[PDB]
Design a protein around this ligand. Structure first.
Ligand SMILES: Cc1cc2nc3c(=O)[nH]c(=O)nc-3n(C[C@H](O)[C@H](O)[C@H](O)COP(=O)(O)OP(=O)(O)OC[C@H]3O[C@@H](n4cnc5c(N)ncnc54)[C@H](O)[C@@H]3O)c2cc1C
Ligand SMILES: NC(=O)C1=CN([C@@H]2O[C@H](COP(=O)(O)OP(=O)(O)OC[C@H]3O[C@@H](n4cnc5c(N)ncnc54)[C@H](OP(=O)(O)O)[C@@H]3O)[C@@H](O)[C@H]2O)C=CC1
Length: 514
């Protein structure tokens, strides 16, 4: 018996355990397949792994002593340093004693008679808990490219999510499939280290500089002496990235001023900065969106000197979503040892024991093939668990057509289950999202113990309500006209929404007593 069981020991799971155990005095147990805390920051160890959020905001806000103690080494934070940070959080707050590592959860069945959850590990260990906290993260199963003969490769073959230790690059011909956020980071990091690099690009994306620089002691003092206001700005923002979120229409200024504003963001760095600190309608107005695209296209044409390589790197879609961010990606393609293959025009048709074969018949001989090919959608981590709620319906069947939920934290037909960083949540910096959701869930659980209620479930109508406001907001935005579900109202408005619920006797939830 526990009051609550937590699945996950990343950002979301660690704060779930701290809040429920230490601030609400509940008996809690957390589970993770990993051998150590960190979640994705433990698993994902590929070359160039780096946060999109600046270091001073990609962390917890609730421990004011930790904020003053925190190492702020560079403007953005690398994977080993995030892992060290989360390890420090677990050390200080004595969290590992209530985490069972090396333990996967195979099934969670709701007991409508007892109003609690039956949780079974992959090693046939069974536990009971009133509440189930799922902190599964945004990444589901790794997506490997389905290419004929991929199993015949005799060289080194790795998905970026399973990057091994001790990988050496010198003297090797290396290929990378994928030019998303992960592919851009890997390509930029290893191009100077390999004998030759082939990039297999199916769809070119826009990328802006991240501007990762060392932080002076004065830089760090400016942050730490003003940390209270910094976090106040995060909670009062849409994105939680510390940006000066613009309301200025793109076309409302001259072409000269518009170039100056984009260049200012380009120099300071950041993908969210480029869309949302420059102007306020780049994700809404088609003409504004094209203006943002053309600036980056001009940058690509200026950086990469071979015009034909520049064209291959230039995105073709009419409208643009999130720009990537990089630490020198486009410059990579000026190198003598880098080849760019347009795999939309020249698809990969086969790979053999020593090569990747394109449709033109060319054998690209490789010692190592890196698959930066992404993951399944976020609900896949839930579908991967045998979660059964009321009447025995499984989350696999309940979400056969995609995820739907109430406020991004409760699922109809699944009582006493609360998701942290689950689907249908806000589009913002994730640590502020996770802190908001954990505090909201913990307040609801505390409200449950105070009023002797032992079953909490969101109604079907509340779920469809939440789906409606998400679809309404999303359809005002170009994110539907371009390249599984998000609330796009921002962190501030998201916090207003869930506050209205908790302030009105948890409107939309069923609360059973006993
Ligand atoms: C390089 C990189 C940079 C990023 N930068 C940003 C950024 O700037 N801003 C941002 O908002 N987001 C960013 N992200 C996204 C990132 O996933 C989140 O910021 C955050 O780490 C999510 O934490 P989490 O605890 O919610 O999930 P995770 O860290 O993914 O933790 C999930 C954990 O649950 C465990 N688990 C899952 N299923 C089971 C099961 N059945 N049994 C047992 N254990 C299970 C997993 O093993 C894992 O340890 C970045 C991601 C990467 C990889
Ligand atoms: N710094 C950060 O905050 C980071 C965040 N992330 C997040 O995690 C998620 C994953 O990012 P990423 O790991 O880049 O995965 P993505 O899905 O974002 O990028 C996948 C890449 O692989 C290519 N690809 C996929 N399947 C094939 C195939 N069969 N043949 C050829 N090419 C293929 C895609 O091309 P196409 O576009 O043509 O499908 C795309 O270029 C993203 O949502 C991102 O936001 C990840 C890393 C860093």
């Amino acid at each position: 018996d526990f009051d609550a069981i937590i699945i996950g020991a990343g950002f979301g799971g660690l704060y779930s355990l701290k809040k429920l155990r230490d601030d609400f005095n509940l008996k809690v147990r957390a589970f993770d397949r990993a051998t150590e805390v960190g979640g994705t920051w433990f698993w994902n160890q590929y070359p160039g792994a780096l946060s999109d959020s600046e270091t001073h905001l990609y962390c917890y806000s609730w421990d004011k002593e930790l904020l003053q103690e925190m190492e702020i080494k560079r403007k953005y934070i690398s994977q080993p340093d995030v892992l060290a940070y989360l390890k420090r959080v677990a050390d200080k707050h004595d969290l590992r004693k209530d985490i069972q590592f090396e333990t996967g959860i195979r099934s969670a069945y709701f007991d409508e008679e007892n109003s609690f959850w039956n949780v079974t590990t992959e090693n046939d260990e069974k536990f009971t808990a009133r509440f189930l906290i799922t902190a599964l993260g945004p990444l589901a199963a790794p997506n490997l490219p389905k290419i004929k003969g991929i199993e015949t490769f005799k060289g080194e073959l790795h998905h970026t999510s399973r990057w091994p230790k001790d990988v050496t690059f010198s003297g090797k011909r290396v290929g990378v499939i994928g030019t998303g956020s992960t592919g851009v980071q890997v390509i930029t990091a290893i191009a100077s280290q390999v004998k030759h690099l082939t990039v297999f690009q199916r769809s070119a994306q826009y990328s802006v500089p991240i501007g990762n620089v060392v932080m002076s002691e004065t830089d760090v003092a400016k942050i730490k002496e003003n940390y209270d206001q910094i976090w106040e700005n995060v909670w009062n923002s849409a994105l939680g990235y510390g940006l000066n979120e613009s309301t200025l229409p793109t076309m409302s200024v001259s072409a000269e001023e518009r170039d100056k504003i984009f260049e200012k963001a380009w120099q300071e760095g950041g993908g969210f900065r480029f869309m949302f600190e420059t102007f306020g309608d780049i994700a809404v107005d088609e003409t504004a969106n094209i203006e943002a695209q053309n600036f980056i296209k001009k940058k690509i044409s200026e950086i990469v000197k071979d015009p034909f390589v520049a064209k291959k790197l230039t995105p073709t879609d009419l409208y643009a979503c999130r720009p990537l961010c990089d630490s020198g990606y486009y410059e990579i393609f000026n190198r003598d040892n880098v080849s760019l293959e347009d795999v939309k025009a020249n698809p990969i048709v086969e790979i053999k024991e020593d090569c990747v074969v394109t449709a033109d018949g060319v054998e690209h001989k490789l010692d190592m093939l890196i698959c930066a090919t992404g993951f399944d959608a976020v609900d896949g981590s839930y579908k991967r668990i045998d979660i059964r709620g009321k009447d025995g319906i499984s989350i696999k069947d309940h979400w056969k057509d995609g995820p739907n939920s109430y406020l991004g934290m409760m699922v109809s037909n699944f009582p006493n289950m609360f998701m942290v960083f689950g689907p249908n949540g806000p589009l913002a910096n994730s640590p502020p999202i996770i802190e908001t959701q954990v505090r909201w869930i913990a307040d609801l659980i505390g409200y449950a113990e105070d009023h002797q209620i032992n079953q909490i479930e969101a109604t079907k109508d509340a779920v469809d309500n939440w789906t409606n406001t998400c679809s309404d907001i999303a359809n005002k935005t170009l994110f539907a006209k371009a390249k599984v579900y998000l609330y796009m109202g921002g962190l501030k408005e998201y916090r207003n929404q869930i506050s209205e619920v908790s302030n009105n006797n948890y409107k939309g939830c069923l609360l059973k007593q006993s």
